[PDB]
Structure 1
Amino acid sequence: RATNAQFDSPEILRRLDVRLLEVSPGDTGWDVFSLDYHVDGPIATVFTRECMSHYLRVFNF
């Protein structure tokens, strides 16, 4: 809420959060920084679960 993504719908930015990656002996936050968008309901089929797991791999690149 300090950039040009405050002009979008509040629901989508609200459902975003930082997530810490599963398992880590002590190292940089760069390796374990991730995002997770919360989504439920009918569009969870169009936004397919396995497709999100591939989306995070795009996100790392």
Structure 2
Amino acid sequence: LGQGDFIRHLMDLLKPELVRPATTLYQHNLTGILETAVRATNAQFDSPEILRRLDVRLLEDTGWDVFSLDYHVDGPIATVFTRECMSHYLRVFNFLWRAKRMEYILTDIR
């Protein structure tokens, strides 16, 4: 979440979707929303290569409990991350996602 500008728009577009239960959620729909955010925010001016790996994954309730980004990496660069950094980032990304919706709720009440 070090970008901030991109995650702001991404939390405004997933609001109408994640409120529904997880059973009606299918991954093929959210990708069009993520792709829309990367185009509108400042993340468009970015290396096309790294943007090819950034996608969504569905953890396996409510839509605010199974959504998370993945950024899969394979090849030579995969010897630095080694399937454990990707099992640690997602362990972190939840705590930064919760502490981000608990704030945009409290600026909506305000």
Normalised-by-shorter TM-score class: 0.7 to 0.9
Quote the sequence identity (%): 100
Matching residue of 2:84:
50
State the distance in 1 between where 2:94 and 2:72 align.
Answer: 19
- Bigger proportion of residues as helix: 2
Number of matched pairs = 57
Matching residue of 2:52:
14
Structure 1 residue 51, shift from structure 2 partner: 1.3
Q: Give the superposed CA RMSD.
A: 1.2
State the distance in 2 between where 1:45 and 1:57 align.
Answer: 20
State the distance in 1 between where 2:56 and 2:87 align.
Answer: 16
Q: With the length of structure 1 as denominator, give the TM-score of the two structures.
A: 0.80
Q: Tell me which structure has the larger Cα radius of gyration.
A: 2
State the distance in 2 between where 1:54 and 1:42 align.
Answer: 20
In structure 1, runs of 5+ residues without a counterpart are: none
Matched, 1:60 2:94: yes
Structure 1 residue 53, shift from structure 2 partner: 0.4
